[model samples]
Target: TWELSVHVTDLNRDVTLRVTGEVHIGGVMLKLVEKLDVKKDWSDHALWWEKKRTWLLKTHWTLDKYGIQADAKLQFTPQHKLLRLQLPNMKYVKVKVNFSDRVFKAVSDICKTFNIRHPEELSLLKKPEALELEPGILAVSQPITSPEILAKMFKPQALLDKAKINQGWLDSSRSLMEQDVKENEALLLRFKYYSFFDLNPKYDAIRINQLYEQAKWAILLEEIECTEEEMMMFAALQYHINKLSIMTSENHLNNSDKEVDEVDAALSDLEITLEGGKTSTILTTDITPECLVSPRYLKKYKNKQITARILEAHQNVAQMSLIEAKMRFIQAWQSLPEFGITHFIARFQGGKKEELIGIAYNRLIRMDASTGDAIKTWRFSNMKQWNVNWEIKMVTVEFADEVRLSFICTEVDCKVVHEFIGGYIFLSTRAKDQNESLDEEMFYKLTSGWV
Candidate 1:
């Protein structure tokens, strides 16, 4: 709610003058508190404010008399040149003057020319730092000719105070690292002392080893010269160790084999029927190559009723092939889950060839007819049209109350197997065979009803 006005004039034919006037509010009538002016002698017409030819006019009025404060500045230029003026408080308003014979003749025109209203809000100027060194002063400090040395000589307290803060941060880091080491030691001891003779010894061993290695690596990390790879490897080892330890502790590790056997026996009674009016018996009692391969054989020779089912399923599987299945699994794994399923696709290579592999899994409380219906419905609802260039293969389907899935690839040149966990949707690769890339994704896709 502030207002401003500016004016310019020609003082005879010899001098040009410019002025800005501002109004401010008081308890009653609006008051004029400031005025700025610049007088330029036109004997030598130049576009700059030189001390010889230009003079600045300033005036300030007190609020007690005028109810406000006001100040202004002005400048002059030739007919072809432009003149500009800026008010201290109204920095954004710039006035440019163009001189012409007509403009010069009418001296009254300059008096009412430029006027601007102050904005409601103006940008606040930033305060400068107080500790800045004076310009052109070197900041280096030595035993001689240094202001710091002089300060130390005259004011030792300031030097001591500065050192105190620096030492505090250094000491804090040391103490924190020491405490971290102590905690890591306790964690390592738990893993090292735990017994591993139960049915799932590998799980326990892996868990304990992970924590033990982590503690060892933490000790190594204290070394200042450790390489990036060394630090990362240590971190990775510690992570796996901690993960295995927690898993073992939660699951108790003792009943894993028994649970696997129980599930296998239950799976034996389940039946699978193919699309071509053929049926295949599921040997859920054992998870061996014979059970899977023998079914194919029975349908091929011994049983005509299941033969059509095996042929059609095999034909459908053959269309996309295992490599294509691996690719699909990878794509699904990489895609963010809108639901519960986590999918991942991986690739393995040797000297020349590469193979696609995938792994996926989901947590289950139980698997029954209702579970199958839910899975089948989910699968049937999200089906997409098939592309001939990209084949699809149905890999293994594993059902578990907990989490478990595995895969193996057919490509001889492959060596790495990728593992995907549904719980956190974690992805990892393992090297198991030099000849075959493991297809863990096929297991996840099929088991999660992601056909």
Candidate 2:
């Protein structure tokens, strides 16, 4: 009999067992698993003889069949781990991953499956616990094992948690086992940056369409501020996209009903410009009701003026193709001053006046609530440290120039503001550390999210 030590790489521990040369390594591995108290599904572990610097691949063969020795130090690691991955479209897929495989392989494979060209802008995010989803609601820390609760826990809206795994935990160079990724664990494929120019209709129509929906809702919900003409342009672009979709679709035109008749009128009313200098129809009766505007704008302009602006904007983009319209739509809205920013209502401690605080990837902005204009801005590099006093609901931030500003949150909790800054800083540090370059072209590519 020979006493040997098997070093489990993942556990960072060793197990000892007694075995004979005549016995197969498969049985020895089973004994090792039992001794280490590992999961039953993880029995497919690979063994390596540390002294010979060789892998023991022949599991069926006996130990003595391949020059078995006594007191050998064996390295053990799981051969493969099956992961449940969630795509950007909220679809799930199972991927078989090897312990030795790099994260780049999994990323490239999944990108190919989803037809995403911008793989570098994606990250493998860890699944957040249920408590993190709605903290105040679930005060108890009991086990959530009920079947009905399990089904209800996984909603599309609840999957928007921002816990990215690679910000500081691990990067592409790290292995799956090194990160302690378990069997059947779920990872999320999320967009780390919003780069609209990289979107192509041919390869990534789903991705671009989803991004369009997000931007559309942002406008409809009045979450972002933009000029009246800019909103008109977005509506015009949506009209073009909807028209293209309706025209290219099958089976709907073949059938006839009141719904189909209304669709026919909508299509016929939107006339095209001809070569003989014929004017194109801009807005239709059906489109007018759907072009919803913010209530704040209703105070400034009447419905007639708003309709006129939308019609004028539609005429300018009447000749564009579906692809061109989509591209232009994203380009216009993505460059807005308050686009992709989070806003909070607060009161400045010094002046005791209400202020609008906007937080983005790179800077903290204090905007005037009435005029929607920025009063002061602090870049992340210029900012030193920030603290939130939960008792008083106050947030204080210090700058590199030895200036400090305190604000009492009036609308939401102050911790939300502190978390936003910390989250952005975490993501910013990862980008700056990995890829360093000086050229302006490359600079824009890497720092696009730093808007």
Candidate 3:
């Protein structure tokens, strides 16, 4: 998707030459593909024909004269052999590559130099083909394809590395492109018949498009995942991984009533990183078609990030010895409150199903007056608590004496969120002076009903 170059082959003179630095996609490139017919070439019966200007030559008009910068590769075939090879779907460039500069390196060394992490999953096709300049490095120009079931294991670097291990870096000889091949029969008949039973069309059909997509996507998907893992590289290759859906089967696509819904449902489980900064919108998979494609097998981008983080990644505050582990809580009953609303996002550290969340408010008042019916007489659904968790809670008690909060047991739930539910171990009182403090025995007797 960047830069410029061209490779030209001359038919009449029977010679091939490379045009290194400057190249463009335009009618002018045709001149380079033309043979200088000594006066014999000037009569130009081929150029005079409408077919040469029409189907024979390439043109897209750009950078200076060509204004376009796609890698241009042209080979001249005598007028006779044009139809099938230049067919629409089969349009592809033949890229030749050279992997390493060093001669005679080990396969493992080649893999390391080219950034191939999982070299164990690969083996060269047939035998290693090499360029004469560097006999040690492998060389070739074509895509290696696989079913999506086996696709996730490929990181983009591995694909590029395979190219380099045999061929050189794609930069100079990078004429890779879009395509598939057909037999003397139609493109479809061959694919449908031979690509069955034990036959895999992937290799036979020459799936250039799929190869391009996988290499490009592996790089992209890697960038997004690495960021979520706090392993982002800076800029161009960087992107925020706010949300993702990964499906895990060859039959699934991010389309159809069932598949798209599956993606939507999976993405719904992701809440953004507090660190994802202030992007206001949730990431939407529906906006792009690529989000709908294969990888189709994998639906969520989490890859265990959020779940693992919550399960035990960040450890704020400070650790205390096991015996000193204690639960502390506060319930305000009096004082003019100034703060607006305090928002708390909670998670069931123990897990999702078996948990409890509730709060009770009580008051011990002047005994003889209206103290008999002190607790409120309303009945609300604890079902609300169990069914839909409360994400935000706000209250201002201005006056009260006691408070209650229901919590799942630490033995039953998790060790961190809550253990005693609502109590302070050896808590100090509000008394500022000696006379205001409560009697020690009285304090023990009163709070015996506390937690």
Model 2, residue pairs in steric clash? none
User: Per-residue alpha-carbon lDDT of model 1 for 1-451, expressed as tens digits?
Assistant: 3322222223322222222223212211112112223433443232222222222211232222333223222223232333222222111222223332222111122222311111100111111111222221111111112323322333322212321221111111011122212111211011111111121222322222222332232223231123333333332222222222222123343212122113322232224433432432222111111112212233244444333443333333222321232222222222323222211121222213222222123231111111111222112112222111112221232343432222323221111111112211211122232435334343344223221
133-227: candidate 3 lDDT, tens digit per residue: 22211111112233342355534332222322222111111111111111121110001000112112222112222222222343334411223
* Each prediction's number of clashing residue pairs: 18, 0, 27
Please identify model 1 stretches exceeding 4 Å from their true place. 1-301, 325-451
Q: On a 0 to 1 TM-score scale, where does candidate 1 land against the true structure?
A: 0.13
Candidate 2 lands at a TM-score of 0.45
lDDT of 1 at 55: 24
* Pick by lDDT: 2 or 3, better one: 2
TM-score of each: 0.13, 0.45, 0.17
Residues 336-451 of candidate 2 have per-residue lDDT tens digits of 87665556677785666566677777887887766667888888888887767767888888998787878877323354465456546555654445544223233223323222
Best of the candidates, TM-score? 2
